[PDB]
Amino acid sequence: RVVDPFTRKEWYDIKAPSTFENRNVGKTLVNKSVGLKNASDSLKGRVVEVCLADLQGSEDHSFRKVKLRVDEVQGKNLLTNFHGMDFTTDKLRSMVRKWQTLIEANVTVKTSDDYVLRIFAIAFTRKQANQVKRTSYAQSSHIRQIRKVISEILTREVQNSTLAQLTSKLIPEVINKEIENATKDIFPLQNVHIRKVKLLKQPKFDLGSLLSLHG
């Protein structure tokens, strides 16, 4: 018996939400539709990980990955919704050098459009111009203050208009900039990166929302 999985495999093409400048991202190669267990209910819970520097074209976002879950099934086409704005393992580790303090802010939030999200913020103290002090630390209480400020900023940003706006904001890193602007008055800080985004709870399937991210 022939067991070759090319005759019994279907070649679909992945479309990213209207938040990203590139329409099509890649080619998902799943299963040729046979009666019972059809390639429509077979999908959904399949998440594609892809970078932003292909989705935008700009190589400023060469770091950081984006996770996209299947939410829309069409005729010989799959349309996806956002899931997890994560970070590249090599870039975060290159940010972590000796001497500078790593500040990790971790916030659980709820969306206005009814979704449970988790946002992490990895920050570093900077050896600014004219510093003879070879080491570059913080002062523990200062770290805590910074974390609190970051949490406040996250609360401000989230609970305000959907995931689609949040994703857009993430795209050219505006949140980071705003945090830097805020926290410059407590402790210097370089990088200040949003790193990881984790979505937890999805209540309904919906349709309108899915549509609104395509056109």
Partner: protein
């Protein structure tokens, strides 16, 4: 312009895997396990075997449709080694020089935030 695959190299200290998946990763294209190509168990961590495996995978894939490839690399970890062993680099080289286009190499080694008590037992492994 190009069809993109995901390589997912598991070249741990003992055996290599060139387990080429989709883009979500749920459906595999071709795997060809690194230690299958050479039936000498000394030559499983060997670069040559890995290279051969990679070549085989390229033959399966490049001459069927997939032209471009993102390369994930992990040589185990968590409790094991956390370090790229012999066979990953060789595999990558093979992939490059068989003719397949590269879509950004990356390392996804499982690194814990401090894990369970790993093997050895305090005094550890004795060579």
């Amino acid at each position: 312009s190009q069809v993109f695959g995901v390589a997912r190299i598991f070249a741990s200290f003992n055996d290599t895997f060139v387990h080429v998946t989709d883009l979500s990763g749920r459906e595999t294209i071709a795997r060809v396990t690194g230690g299958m190509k050479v039936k000498a168990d000394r030559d499983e961590s060997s670069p040559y075997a890995a290279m051969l495996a990679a070549q085989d995978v390229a033959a399966k894939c490049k001459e069927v449709g997939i032209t471009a490839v993102h390369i994930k690399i992990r040589a185990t970890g968590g409790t094991r080694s956390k370090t790229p062993g012999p066979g990953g680099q060789a595999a990558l080289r093979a992939l490059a020089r068989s003719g397949l286009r590269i879509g950004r190499i990356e390392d996804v080694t499982p690194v814990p935030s401090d894990s369970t008590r790993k093997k050895g037992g305090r005094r550890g492994r004795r060579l």
